[PDB]
Each structure stands twice: as structure tokens, then as C-alpha cells.
Amino acid sequence: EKKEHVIIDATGQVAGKLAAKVAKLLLEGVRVTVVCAEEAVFVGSLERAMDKFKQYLNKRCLVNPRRGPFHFREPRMHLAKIIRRMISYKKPRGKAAMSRLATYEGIPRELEGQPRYKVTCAFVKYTGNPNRYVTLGKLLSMFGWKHAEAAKSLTDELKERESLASLQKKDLDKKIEELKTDKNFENEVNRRLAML
Amino acid sequence: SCRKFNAPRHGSLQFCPRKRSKTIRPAAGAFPADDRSQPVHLTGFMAYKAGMTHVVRTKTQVAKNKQLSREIMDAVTVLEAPPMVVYGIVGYEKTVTGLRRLPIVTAAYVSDGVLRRMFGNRYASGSVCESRVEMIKERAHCVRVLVQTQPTLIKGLGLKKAHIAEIQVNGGSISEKVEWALGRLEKEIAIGEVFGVNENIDTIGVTKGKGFQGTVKRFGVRKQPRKSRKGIRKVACIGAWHPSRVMYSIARAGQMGFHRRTEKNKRVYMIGNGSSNIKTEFDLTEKPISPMGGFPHYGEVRNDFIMVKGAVVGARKRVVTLRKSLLRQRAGEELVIKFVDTSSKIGHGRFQTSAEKKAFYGA
RNA sequence: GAAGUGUGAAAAGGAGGAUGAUGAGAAAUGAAAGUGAAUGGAGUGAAUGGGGGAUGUUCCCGCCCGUCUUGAAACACGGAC
RNA sequence: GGGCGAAAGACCAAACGAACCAUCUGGUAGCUGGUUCCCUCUGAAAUGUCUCUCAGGACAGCGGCGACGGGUGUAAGAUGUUGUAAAGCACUAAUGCGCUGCGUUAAACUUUGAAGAUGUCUUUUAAGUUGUUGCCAGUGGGCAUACUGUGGUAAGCAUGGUGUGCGAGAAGGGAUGAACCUUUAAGCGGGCUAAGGAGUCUUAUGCAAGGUGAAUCCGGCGGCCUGAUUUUGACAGCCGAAUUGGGCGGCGGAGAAAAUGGAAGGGAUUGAAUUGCAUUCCGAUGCCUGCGGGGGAGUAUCUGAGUAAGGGGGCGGUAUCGUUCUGCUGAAGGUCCUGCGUGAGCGGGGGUGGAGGGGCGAUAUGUGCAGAUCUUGGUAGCAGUAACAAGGAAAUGAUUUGCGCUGGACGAGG
RNA sequence: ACGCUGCUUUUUGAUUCUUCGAUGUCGGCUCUUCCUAUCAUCGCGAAGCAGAGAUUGCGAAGUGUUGGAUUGUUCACCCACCAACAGGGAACGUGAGCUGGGUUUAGACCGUCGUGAGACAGGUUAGUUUUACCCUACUGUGUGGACUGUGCAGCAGAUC
RNA sequence: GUAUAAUGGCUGAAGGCCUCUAAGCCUGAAGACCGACUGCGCGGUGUGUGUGGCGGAAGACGACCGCUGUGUGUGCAAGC
Structure with a gap:
């Protein structure tokens, strides 16, 4: 019955702390779109984040890799998969909640004059490592993502x-x-x- | 358990699954890198396979290196290439999701062979042209043209239905690429204006079909010994107990041939016209480029042709796509050709030039 | 060394089909397994069950019984209906 | 129980290291399989003695159903018994030195000696509130754990002791689990807690201090304990202020190598996986409180899990004798719809059917099925599948032409 | 050296929890994949490293690691070549995939043992290898134009 | 083609000296990722298919590539 809509901006937001709160909004019947998905951050060093993505790529069905897990390298597709695994998505109440989400790199053109919001607890400056983090766009460009310069242009x-x-x-x-x-x-x- | 006597695996997993091709005219996967400090040109062409022959060649070493000059006999392939026609322009701009195609410019009169390919054999039942030209000039990161072949000039194919494609235009200044192709709509461009002698080239086509084949032929595995029950043309063990499933890397029976393949670094030897005498050779006779009796299962070559060194994918009368090299090429050794064989390919032909046969028997 | 009983009070009559006649009645009664035709609903999830609600579903819970055994959903045995 | 055999235990009418047919014969089985309706009250043992006894049995122990009959599985005051742990050298047996002392030991050593156990007297001590006997079942392969022994290099190994569990125990929690922690069993309402928890799956808040698998090594800290040097100028290489040796307690790093892709339960998390806290909150079928139903009880009430096993009260098939009714104005059976009962089951309505059918009391039983590689009959999927046939032709076919090889008589058998 | 502390699961034992109304029991041949405790190839340290040839250590599992005589053999041992001829796991991988030399009931010979019927992990010779047409897995194929974009999955050259 | 491992170096404190390291930086592998090459789903667009018959370069059957009367027969060429 609800018809509310919220635009969320991810620029200095810890990616796990934002995903856990965005998924509780979807379960309570709210529509969300996350823009600027390549600007979310991971606390720590780039050597620690590349080692963790490399173990992810190793998981693979030996009998037939076409059935196997699928490794997405786009920032909008990768952050959408972190929100999906916050919830029980095989069941029908979870299928509906995933119908209320949209994700983008940069800002698309239709959402030009509408207000955006940030999540109050995911600011990177509340941790003890402000000024040691990696953006989601720099990590993924080292595994195949191509459109990192075309996304900074469209936003400015x-x-x-x-x-x-x-x-x-x-x-x-x-x-x-x-x-x-x-x-x-x-x-x-x-x-x-x-x-x- | 641990398996003494290791050997390499039979066949390559680069090309699994081995399905039929979904088309007879595959589209190229990439195009060369644009250097905008040159004049404007094209990067590809479409031709038709005719047959094979000889050539003798002088290996230039005539310095007092211990072998001054050798003779070398090389096999070649001939392709028949009538000129192509341009009937459109295409631009692509850049977005956050990649290349987006802009609306297309059609010329003034689209041929009747281009309309059969687009809408089937029963198809017969402005300033907006100028506004679309401005977009390809403001936007449009890269530019391509739409070209079509003229199969009705080779009446041994029996087509009337043309093959069409998009080819990138190289040479700088995007506004210069557009105005070069605006003065070329509805006209022809010939294969001598694209490729030149002693250059390396790529080919793209479909291989000869063989149907359903056994595993001794599809992959090259061993036969079993002669005492064996239940046949000898097969693989004996298709897996271990665990995992309790058959793997995608086991050899099985199935479709062989009619695949899409891309081959690279084929050297161009000659460029001529079929309705005149081939020369640049060091012998006197006239000899057009077609053997006594004709190319077997093909007619004669009466239009432009091109000659390249070695084998070429596919069957006779099938269409092939030619592409400029994507790599770095050094020079190419100096090419000196001095004889081209034109005996009969049916049986063991022993004459060139049927007038030479006529003067042997007398009457 | 088996398996197999029944038109009706009366032959008053049937036995390819269709159209009909006689009779109180087409003719002992005629379950389940399984199937054909029409018509309503649902599906690409193994199915089926209980709670709570409802003209199918959406939340929670739920492994196949019988048996011997220290111990069974068992890669323990018997069990197509 | 005989034959026959150039010998193989071969052959004697498709089974021969003793044929086939009928009877004795429902031959015996300490062994395997099966053993048919509901609700309700009580509820075990896997141990000892004897056994050609060890996969069995008897006797005793534990349990059910009774009947008859009046008057302590914990402590206190007094007074006895004991030889382990620990310790020690007084006896028995061991063990190094110094020339009286110093040093090391004990299941089959004890000069000593606990905690704990175990007798008797006094309810003329506390606190609480049973005796005698009848008829009988199942059971005699156990297993886990806290603490504690023995054998073994050790074992999810084998074998003893004391308690409590699973067995025969659901439900809440520990992601998952016979046995771990809470707690003992699904009627209709209203309240509160336990174990465990409060980013998200998934019901529910915060405050603070540190931080960003062995021998054997290395570093750090506004940490702590101990020493030394120094404004009369230290340490480091004239300068101007702290320098340094040993240890301890937390923390981090080396030592650290396996076979399908993979697991603090997952995504993740720089404290959302560390430590210390409580002024908030969530959470069972457990507790308190109001109704309903059963069973006891001396009638103001108390009390409900249960395999093997035993007792009480009910439902249903077919008949007899004993009584009392109904059917052609449509019985039983069968099918669909509907009421009552905790349940086994019992009624009514509309079609079909075309002749019989019931209630209540006592009585007689071939008296209730999902299973037994159960018996007999019918029927699915597999599946229009495997297998088999389609013999040379000429509009016609007593004519023309093409191919194969058994063909004709007597006997046995029909 | 004398002593002391670990890891693996490739040996052989120890045990008896699962299966006796049956899970086909050795080796070879064929074929695929994984581990690193690296034999060769690539990069880089130490020296009682002058050069040459080797010896010892670290990063590293992408690609390679053969042909024969004797034995059923696994194993072993020699010959020839080589950049080098490393070691292991996958129901001691793999019998409705094969083969059947070992083992191998019923025939027979020898030696030792037994009065005898017979015995021996002592030797020798002769001795049936059954069934897929079902589900899944995997290989192709089908599931209704023309020109193209972009996500996912596969992946190749190596050595002298 | 980009970024790295072991190792070797630049600047530089802690610790007035020293030091490739604590902040930063340079170099560097048959390895990693990417490119190129093959396959599949999903998108977009001045765009939606010859019923039947006959052929083949295609084919177990379906499909795919072609035409919409240009075959058959005969002659010449080229061969055994």
C-alpha cells in the first residue's frame, strides 16, 4: 500500500554499515535507489581488500563452471549483491523486497533536482581509521571495470x-x-x- | 592413485562448447587502433573463396652469404573480390554503460539486394537526413559505414541477396571522417584501395562441415587393443567415483566442423583483375589467373581478385571477411615471384595454356 | 488335478450403426485401483501435512513408515497400487 | 545303500558324494519374520547365585492388582571402629657424598595421620508425618557424563568405583547433534521470568578501558617492581637534559606444509569476532492469577510425560432366547451433501436401487488389519518402447520375365 | 654428536563403530582432475664464489617429466636418449570400460607330514567374466527476422 | 598491456648517530589481472521472416544456406 521513495547518496559511507540499514527499509515497504555506488569505501589498506576479492574469485564449481557462482565486477552490481545477501532472498517475502531496489554509478539524469539523504552511522570519520580506506571504484578497476572516468564526468x-x-x-x-x-x-x- | 607416465591432454578447452555457428557472415570482434595523424581509409573488406594453386619465388640472399639465391615453392589461395557499395553512416557515443549507437543516415536509394537481406524475399508487399548528420559530428566517439557486396557479378553463386556489414573508418578528425563518407554514398570502393602487396592480414569465416563425429576424430584419442569387447573407437574411463558426476573436460561425441574461426598473419602476394593477363613474372606467356578447365567446383575468375599465402578457412563459394592487422609488424621480406602454375587441377595436368596442348598432338 | 451360479411375473426382444417396439423397469445390484470427454482454477517450484487465516499460494513449524537394536531419515532389511 | 563304469565320484528320462512317487507328517526348531478398536490410572530391568552354561533357563531383586489391620537415603548431645591422601624414616627394601652432618625414595614399607565414611543410646533432643499377607507379568546384550582408579605409546580402545542422565523425556536455547545449559508435556483468556541474547537474516539498549598447536626466539606499553648515571653538565656524536641494566604482568609477531570450491552459521564488521560493567529491554508448553475437563481424597482440596508390562470405563461384526418397532405411499447396499461425539463411531437430506431391515437386556463366538520376499483376483507407470515382419518386378496377373535350393520312396511317431 | 620439541596420513600395526535377505576382491591398459614437501624451465641470495663445472637457500604449481631387456607383479635392477627424466591424493581414482598374467571351488603330478580318510602363506600344469530401452550428470541438437551494444563463462603455446 | 612476489635500492624518523620502513617512493617473475580469441543470456533500433515445391557448399531426424520454372538432354572444353 505504501508509496514512499528515498534516494540515498553513498560518497563517504562504509559499505557494510549502509547495506544493513538499506535492507531493513526494503523489508518495511520502502522504495530505495542508491546513487554514486562507486564512491562507497572499505576501511583499511588496498592490499587487504585485494586479497579478500582474490579468494572470492577462487570459488568455482569444478564439474561445470556455467552453473557456478558468478563474480560481478561492476560497482553497482557488486554493491547490490551485498544488500541481497543481508536477507533471505529465496523466499517470496524476500523476492518482493528485492523488487524495490535500484542502483547506479554516478547520478542518472532523471533524478536531477530531488533531495538525497545519507545514513547517519556509516560516515567513515566516526571510525578510528579516518584517512585509511579504499573506494569501491579503485578496487574494482584493478579487476576489470572500465568506465571509471566516464562516471566522474557525468556526476560533475x-x-x-x-x-x-x-x-x-x-x-x-x-x-x-x-x-x-x-x-x-x-x-x-x-x-x-x-x-x- | 598417483598415476605414473604423464602426457598432455587431447584437444583444447578454449573452444568448448563446440556448437554450430549461428550465421554464415560473422562480424569482426575488434578493429585496429586509430592514429589520427594519417589520411582517412577503411579497415576491412568481404570476398569469396575460389581455389588454390602454386607459385615459385626467389629467396633474395644474393649477398655472399653462403646461399645467394634459393627457389621456394609455395601454395596460395585466390579470392574473388568485386567492388563494394556504401549506403550509410553510423556513429557511436560513450556513456557510463559503454558505446551507445546514434540514429543512422541512409543515402538516397537503397539497392534491391539490400532490401532482400533486411526484409526477406517477399519485401515488395530530407532535412531529417540533415539533422542526423549534425549529431554524428557533435557526438559520436567513433564512426562506421554500412557496405554491401554485389554477388550478381559472380553468376556461379546464384545469390541476388547481399551480405552487409559495418566497417570502422580510421584517420583523424571525426568531422573529416564524416565528410569523406558523405562524398562516397551510393558509389563503389575497390579492394586495391584497402590492401597492398606484402602486407599481413586477418581472415574470419566458417569451417567445412562434417556432421556428427566419433571421439577418435573430434579430439584425437587412442584406439583400444584388438581383443577388446564392446568396440574400440572410444574413451575407456570417463571419471573417478568422486565427484560422482561427469566433468565438462571429458571428451564426448558430437558435432564437428562448421565453426567460427579467426586466423591471423596471412601475407598478401598479388592483386589483379581476372579479365586480363597476370604478369610481373619473369616468363613470357600471357596466362590469365585461372587454370585449364577452371577452378574445380567453381567457375572462372572474371572480376578483381587477391592472392594470399597458405590455407584459408571454409569451403568454395563461401563469403570471407578480411581485416587489417591488430599487432605490430616489422617489414616483410622482399617478394620476387617468377612463375604461377595454371595446369589442370582435374587429373594430372601437364600443359599450361591450351594452345600448348594443341601444338603437341598436331591433329 | 482346476476355474466357472442369477434377463423378466410373463419371451411379451433384442444382439454393425441410426430410427424404433415391448415392459412396472432395458433388465440383478455395480465399490476401489485406473482411464476418456467437456468445463473452472493453478504451475516451470518434487509433491503431500499441522498452526493461524482465507473462494490456490505469500508468515511459522514439518526428513518415511513398520522392525531388530546402546543407537535409524540412513550408503541396515520388508513395502508399485 | 542297488546297478553300471579304459575311473571323471562319471552315468541311471533337463537337478545323482545315494533317483523318482505316496504315507508316517500340521516331523522338531534355545533361531528369522508377522501378530487386527477408542479414552483413561499406575509403571520397570539391562544386576547376584547355579547351569555341556555364555544368542537360552530357573531361583532371588525391581513393578501391577488387591485384601485385612492401629500404634525417616537429614541433623543434634554422648560414646565406639578405621590406616587411605598428605607426610615421614621408628621397622623391611633402596640411595649419593663428608669422616658428626648434608642429599634422594616406596602398589605388595609405617613412628604419625586427616577431610570423609561407618556402629550403639536418648524424641525423658530438632525437623517431618506405616504393619501383615494373597495371585501374578516383563527383565537378566546396555550406553553417556562430572569427579575418581587399573592395563596400554595411544584411541570415538578395553575394564572397575560414587552420583546423575539417555534408554522410557517432549518443549525453549547452544547454526546443525540420543546424553550439553533451562526446564519437566499442545484446553480458553490476563500478567512475569529462565537459559540465551539485543548491526542484518531474527523478537529486543547502552556506558567505559586498551587496540587498529610445542620447544625455542623477537618487539612494544603515559603499565608495574627493582637497581645504577646526571646542571660540580650525563647519554649520542663544544653542545644543554634526561640516560641506562635486570626482571614481572597484559598485548602483537616468527616457528606454522595436502590433496573437488568453502565456511567465527552467512552477507559483513577497524571493535557489529577483545576486556570490564548495568540505571534499560526481549525471550518457553516453566511460575502467579480467572474459567473448562479427567483421576484421587477423610468431601473447605490436591494432582496429570512414558517403552516392556498390568488394571478400570466405553465403541463396533454375525447369531440365539425374550421384549418392543418399521417396509412397495419404496427396505438393505452404494454415492454426494450435512448435524452430533475428546475419540472408537452414530444420525438426517437429494439422486440410484427394487426387497426386506432394526432398538433394548442376557447368552454363544471362525468377533475389528497397512506390513508377514503373506494368499487369490484385478489394475498402473515403464511404452506405442525392446523384439519381430515388410520376399524382384510388369494399371491387369491361368500370360511375360528375375532369384533360392533340398528333389522322390519304405519304417517309428501323428 | 649426547639430549629435547613437533607435523603429515603415503607404510605396517592397534581397535571392532558401519555393511554377512552380498557395496564385484591385485596389477596393467585407457582417460580426466587436484596437492607441493620443486626434478627441469623463469626471477633472486650465500660461499672455504678467480673462470668453467657443480653445492646450499628463498619467491614460484603456468608448462613439461620419454623409449627398451628380465619378472603377473607393486617393487627392483640394468641399457639408450634427455632441459629434466620429482614425489603424492581422487572408495589403496577407474571390471554393466577392457583384459584376466597373480589370486583363482570341482581334474592331475612332486616333496615333506599323517595308520588312514586327508593337510601345507611349499612348488607345478588345465580351468564360463551376465543385464541399461529408466532418473540424473555430461555431449551435441531443437525451443519462430536483420544490424549491433555489454555482462557473464571458457581460455595456449612451451622447450631445445 | 597494467599492477605486484622474493631480492636489490631512494628519501627518512623513532634513538642529535645509524638504518630499504614506521608516512611516502623507484625497480622487478615461465606467476596474477586485463587484452585478443570462442560460446551463451539480456538490451537497443527510421528495421519482424515464402504456404508449398526444388537444389546444396548444410544435414541421423528436426534445423541451416539458396532460388521462386533455367532444370533435364545434347555439344564443346578439361581429364582417365
Whole structure:
């Protein structure tokens, strides 16, 4: 019955601490889209993160690898798989919850002037290792991801044309302000107020 | 358990699964790297396989190295290549998900062989052209043209239905690539304007079909000894108890041939026209490029042709795709050809030039 | 050294089909296993069950019985219906 | 129990190291398999003695059903018994030195000697509230664990002691498990806890200190214990202020090598896998509280798990004698729909069917099925599958032409 | 050296928890995959490393590791070649895949033992290898155009 | 083609000296990843298929590649 929608921005967010909270929203009937999926971070060193992804790639059905586990190298597909394994997705109540999620690298064009939110507990500056982390985009570019320069471009062009739209809006707030402080303005509105 | 006497495995897993090809004209997987400091050219062509012959060649070593000059006899393949026609332009831009294709520019009049390939044999039952040209110039990271063959000039195929493809345009200045192809719509481009003699080339095609084949032929395993019950053409053990399943790396019986294959580093030897005398040889006679009696199971060569060294994928009358090299090439040794054989390939032919047969018997 | 009883009060009559006649009645009664035709619903998940709710499903729980045995869902035996 | 055999234990009407047919004969089986309705009350043993006894049996122990009959599986005050642990050299047996002392030992050594056990008196001590006897079943392969021995290099090895469990014990928790921790059994409501937990699967909060598998080695810390050097200028190489040796307690690193891809339960986590805490919260069929049902009890109440086994009260098949009813105005049987009962089961309605069918009391039994490689009959899947046949032709076929090799008589047998 | 502490599961023992209304018991031939405790090939330390030839150590499992005489053999032992001819696991991998030389009931000979019928992990010779048409796995094939993008899976050259 | 292992080096404290290391950096393998090469699903688009018959370069049967009357027969060429 619910029809609420939320856009979540992942730029300085620990990837595990965000996934556990995004999955509890999906189970309670909320639609989520996560943008800028290549900017989530992993606490620690790049040598520790590459060793853990290398053991993941080793898992493979010897009899027939086409049946076997599938290793995704795109940041939007990889972070979607971390949210899926937070929950029981084989059962029908979990199939529905996964129908309410969307993920993107960068910011797509339709979501241009709508407000975004961050999760209050996943900021990397609350841990004891601020300034030692790896982004999800640098780790995955070392295993095959190609479109890392085309994602930084698309985000900055939208940021700049979302900043100009704020200058037009702010100046009208000053031109409307002077009109509210007028003479023929008030004596008009005091008449409409007069007829309740 | 531990298996004394090791040997290599039989066959390659690079090409498993071994299915039929889904098409007779496979599309190229990659294109060379653009160097935008050259003039604009094309990177490929489509031709048709005719047959094989000889050539004798002088190995240039005539310096006083202990072998001045050797003779070398080499096998070659001939392909018949009529000129192609351009009828469209295509651009691709770059996104976060990769290459996105822009709307297409068609010329003014699309041929009747291009409409049978697109809509079947029973198909007969503006400024918007100018707006689409501006997009391929603002956007469009890379550019390609749409070309088609002219199979009705080789009347031993019996087609009327053309093969069409997209070929990348190399040479710099994306606005220069477009204006070079705008002055080429509806006209022809010949194979002598693409490849040149003594260059390395790639070929792409489909192999000769053989049907359902046993495992001695598909993979090359041993036969069993003569005393053996239940046949000798087979593999004896298909696995261990555990894992309790058959593996994808075991050899089985099935389809052999009619596969898609790409071959590389084939050297070009000659480029000519079939309706004239082949020369640049050091003997006197005239000799067109076609043997006494004709190429077996093929007619004569009457259009342009190209000659390359060695074997070439596929069967006679099937279409092949030619591509420029993707690697780094050094020079190529100097090529000196001095004889091309044109005896009969049916039986053991002993004459060149049927007038030479006529003067042996008298009458 | 077996297996096999029954039209009806009356032959008043049937025995390829169809159309009919006689009779109180087409003719002892006629279960399950299994099948054909039409029509409603569901499915690409082995199926089936209990709680709680409902014109199929969505949440929770649930391994195949009988038996011998220190000990059985058992790669222990018997069991197609 | 005979034959016959150039000998193989061969052959004697498809089974021969003793043929076939009927009877004795339902031959015997300490061994294997099977043994038919509901609810309810009690509830074991896997040990001792004797046994051609060891896969069995008898006797005794533990349990069920009774009947008859009046008056302590814990402590205290007093007073006896014991020779282990530990320790020791007084006896028996061992063991190094110094020329009286120092050094080392004991299941079959004891000068000493516990904790704990075990007798008797006094309810004229506390606290609490049984005797006699009848008829009989099952059981006599056990196993786990806390603590504690013996043999063994050791074992999820073999064999003893004391308690408690599984067996015969569900349910909540430990991801999963006969035996671990909580706790003892699914009626309808209202409250609270236990073990275990409170990022997410998955019901439910925070505060603080550190941090980012053996011998044998290495480092660190606003940690602690002990020593030394120094503003009369140390340590390091004139400079101007701390320097340093040994140890201890936490923490980290080497030592550290296996065979399908893989496991703090998973995704993950820099404290969401470490340590210390409680002022919050969640969580059973357990506890408290209101109703309902059973069984005891001396009638204000108390009490419900259960295999082998035993007792009480009910439901149903077919008949007899004893009584009391119904059917052609449509019985039984069969099929669909519906009411009552904790249940075994008992009623009613509409089609079909075309002749009989019941209630209640006592009585007689060939008296209730899912299983026995059960008996007889019928029927599925496998599966339109395996296997077999399709013999040379000419519109016609007493005509033309192509191929194969047994063909004709007497006897046995029909 | 004299002493002391570990790891593996390839040896042979120790035990008797599973299977006696049956899980086909040795070796070879054929074929695939995994481990590293590395034999060769690639990179790099030490020396009682002048050079040459070797010896000892670390990173590293991608690719290779053969042909014959005698024996049923596993094993063993020699010849020839080689960059080198490492060691192991997968129901002591693999019999509805084969073969049947070892083992191998019923025929027979010899030696020793027994009065005898007979015995011997003592030697020798002759001695039946059954059935898939079911489910799954795996190989192809089918499941309705033309031109292409991009995710996933496979993967090749090595040595003289 | 990119980034690395063992090892060898640059700058540099802790510890006024020293030091390839504690922050950083350079180099470097038959190895890793990527590319190229083969297969499959899913997308997009000025785009949706010859019923039947006859052939083949295709084929167990289905499918695939072609045409929509251009076969058969005969002659020449080229061979045994």
C-alpha cells in the first residue's frame, strides 16, 4: 500500500554499515535507489581488500563452471549483491523486497533536482581509521571495470547545472521579499484578509 | 592413485562448447587502433573463396652469404573480390554503460539486394537526413559505414541477396571522417584501395562441415587393443567415483566442423583483375589467373581478385571477411615471384595454356 | 488335478450403426485401483501435512513408515497400487 | 545303500558324494519374520547365585492388582571402629657424598595421620508425618557424563568405583547433534521470568578501558617492581637534559606444509569476532492469577510425560432366547451433501436401487488389519518402447520375365 | 654428536563403530582432475664464489617429466636418449570400460607330514567374466527476422 | 598491456648517530589481472521472416544456406 521513495547518496559511507540499514527499509515497504555506488569505501589498506576479492574469485564449481557462482565486477552490481545477501532472498517475502531496489554509478539524469539523504552511522570519520580506506571504484578497476572516468564526468556536469538552478532560486527569494514589503501590496492583501 | 607416465591432454578447452555457428557472415570482434595523424581509409573488406594453386619465388640472399639465391615453392589461395557499395553512416557515443549507437543516415536509394537481406524475399508487399548528420559530428566517439557486396557479378553463386556489414573508418578528425563518407554514398570502393602487396592480414569465416563425429576424430584419442569387447573407437574411463558426476573436460561425441574461426598473419602476394593477363613474372606467356578447365567446383575468375599465402578457412563459394592487422609488424621480406602454375587441377595436368596442348598432338 | 451360479411375473426382444417396439423397469445390484470427454482454477517450484487465516499460494513449524537394536531419515532389511 | 563304469565320484528320462512317487507328517526348531478398536490410572530391568552354561533357563531383586489391620537415603548431645591422601624414616627394601652432618625414595614399607565414611543410646533432643499377607507379568546384550582408579605409546580402545542422565523425556536455547545449559508435556483468556541474547537474516539498549598447536626466539606499553648515571653538565656524536641494566604482568609477531570450491552459521564488521560493567529491554508448553475437563481424597482440596508390562470405563461384526418397532405411499447396499461425539463411531437430506431391515437386556463366538520376499483376483507407470515382419518386378496377373535350393520312396511317431 | 620439541596420513600395526535377505576382491591398459614437501624451465641470495663445472637457500604449481631387456607383479635392477627424466591424493581414482598374467571351488603330478580318510602363506600344469530401452550428470541438437551494444563463462603455446 | 612476489635500492624518523620502513617512493617473475580469441543470456533500433515445391557448399531426424520454372538432354572444353 505504501508509496514512499528515498534516494540515498553513498560518497563517504562504509559499505557494510549502509547495506544493513538499506535492507531493513526494503523489508518495511520502502522504495530505495542508491546513487554514486562507486564512491562507497572499505576501511583499511588496498592490499587487504585485494586479497579478500582474490579468494572470492577462487570459488568455482569444478564439474561445470556455467552453473557456478558468478563474480560481478561492476560497482553497482557488486554493491547490490551485498544488500541481497543481508536477507533471505529465496523466499517470496524476500523476492518482493528485492523488487524495490535500484542502483547506479554516478547520478542518472532523471533524478536531477530531488533531495538525497545519507545514513547517519556509516560516515567513515566516526571510525578510528579516518584517512585509511579504499573506494569501491579503485578496487574494482584493478579487476576489470572500465568506465571509471566516464562516471566522474557525468556526476560533475550534473552538479554544476544543479548549482546554477540554486542561484536563480535564491535571487527570486529577494525579489519576492521586497514585494511583500510594499504599499499597494499590503492594502490589497488586507482586503482579502478582510473577507476572511 | 598417483598415476605414473604423464602426457598432455587431447584437444583444447578454449573452444568448448563446440556448437554450430549461428550465421554464415560473422562480424569482426575488434578493429585496429586509430592514429589520427594519417589520411582517412577503411579497415576491412568481404570476398569469396575460389581455389588454390602454386607459385615459385626467389629467396633474395644474393649477398655472399653462403646461399645467394634459393627457389621456394609455395601454395596460395585466390579470392574473388568485386567492388563494394556504401549506403550509410553510423556513429557511436560513450556513456557510463559503454558505446551507445546514434540514429543512422541512409543515402538516397537503397539497392534491391539490400532490401532482400533486411526484409526477406517477399519485401515488395530530407532535412531529417540533415539533422542526423549534425549529431554524428557533435557526438559520436567513433564512426562506421554500412557496405554491401554485389554477388550478381559472380553468376556461379546464384545469390541476388547481399551480405552487409559495418566497417570502422580510421584517420583523424571525426568531422573529416564524416565528410569523406558523405562524398562516397551510393558509389563503389575497390579492394586495391584497402590492401597492398606484402602486407599481413586477418581472415574470419566458417569451417567445412562434417556432421556428427566419433571421439577418435573430434579430439584425437587412442584406439583400444584388438581383443577388446564392446568396440574400440572410444574413451575407456570417463571419471573417478568422486565427484560422482561427469566433468565438462571429458571428451564426448558430437558435432564437428562448421565453426567460427579467426586466423591471423596471412601475407598478401598479388592483386589483379581476372579479365586480363597476370604478369610481373619473369616468363613470357600471357596466362590469365585461372587454370585449364577452371577452378574445380567453381567457375572462372572474371572480376578483381587477391592472392594470399597458405590455407584459408571454409569451403568454395563461401563469403570471407578480411581485416587489417591488430599487432605490430616489422617489414616483410622482399617478394620476387617468377612463375604461377595454371595446369589442370582435374587429373594430372601437364600443359599450361591450351594452345600448348594443341601444338603437341598436331591433329 | 482346476476355474466357472442369477434377463423378466410373463419371451411379451433384442444382439454393425441410426430410427424404433415391448415392459412396472432395458433388465440383478455395480465399490476401489485406473482411464476418456467437456468445463473452472493453478504451475516451470518434487509433491503431500499441522498452526493461524482465507473462494490456490505469500508468515511459522514439518526428513518415511513398520522392525531388530546402546543407537535409524540412513550408503541396515520388508513395502508399485 | 542297488546297478553300471579304459575311473571323471562319471552315468541311471533337463537337478545323482545315494533317483523318482505316496504315507508316517500340521516331523522338531534355545533361531528369522508377522501378530487386527477408542479414552483413561499406575509403571520397570539391562544386576547376584547355579547351569555341556555364555544368542537360552530357573531361583532371588525391581513393578501391577488387591485384601485385612492401629500404634525417616537429614541433623543434634554422648560414646565406639578405621590406616587411605598428605607426610615421614621408628621397622623391611633402596640411595649419593663428608669422616658428626648434608642429599634422594616406596602398589605388595609405617613412628604419625586427616577431610570423609561407618556402629550403639536418648524424641525423658530438632525437623517431618506405616504393619501383615494373597495371585501374578516383563527383565537378566546396555550406553553417556562430572569427579575418581587399573592395563596400554595411544584411541570415538578395553575394564572397575560414587552420583546423575539417555534408554522410557517432549518443549525453549547452544547454526546443525540420543546424553550439553533451562526446564519437566499442545484446553480458553490476563500478567512475569529462565537459559540465551539485543548491526542484518531474527523478537529486543547502552556506558567505559586498551587496540587498529610445542620447544625455542623477537618487539612494544603515559603499565608495574627493582637497581645504577646526571646542571660540580650525563647519554649520542663544544653542545644543554634526561640516560641506562635486570626482571614481572597484559598485548602483537616468527616457528606454522595436502590433496573437488568453502565456511567465527552467512552477507559483513577497524571493535557489529577483545576486556570490564548495568540505571534499560526481549525471550518457553516453566511460575502467579480467572474459567473448562479427567483421576484421587477423610468431601473447605490436591494432582496429570512414558517403552516392556498390568488394571478400570466405553465403541463396533454375525447369531440365539425374550421384549418392543418399521417396509412397495419404496427396505438393505452404494454415492454426494450435512448435524452430533475428546475419540472408537452414530444420525438426517437429494439422486440410484427394487426387497426386506432394526432398538433394548442376557447368552454363544471362525468377533475389528497397512506390513508377514503373506494368499487369490484385478489394475498402473515403464511404452506405442525392446523384439519381430515388410520376399524382384510388369494399371491387369491361368500370360511375360528375375532369384533360392533340398528333389522322390519304405519304417517309428501323428 | 649426547639430549629435547613437533607435523603429515603415503607404510605396517592397534581397535571392532558401519555393511554377512552380498557395496564385484591385485596389477596393467585407457582417460580426466587436484596437492607441493620443486626434478627441469623463469626471477633472486650465500660461499672455504678467480673462470668453467657443480653445492646450499628463498619467491614460484603456468608448462613439461620419454623409449627398451628380465619378472603377473607393486617393487627392483640394468641399457639408450634427455632441459629434466620429482614425489603424492581422487572408495589403496577407474571390471554393466577392457583384459584376466597373480589370486583363482570341482581334474592331475612332486616333496615333506599323517595308520588312514586327508593337510601345507611349499612348488607345478588345465580351468564360463551376465543385464541399461529408466532418473540424473555430461555431449551435441531443437525451443519462430536483420544490424549491433555489454555482462557473464571458457581460455595456449612451451622447450631445445 | 597494467599492477605486484622474493631480492636489490631512494628519501627518512623513532634513538642529535645509524638504518630499504614506521608516512611516502623507484625497480622487478615461465606467476596474477586485463587484452585478443570462442560460446551463451539480456538490451537497443527510421528495421519482424515464402504456404508449398526444388537444389546444396548444410544435414541421423528436426534445423541451416539458396532460388521462386533455367532444370533435364545434347555439344564443346578439361581429364582417365
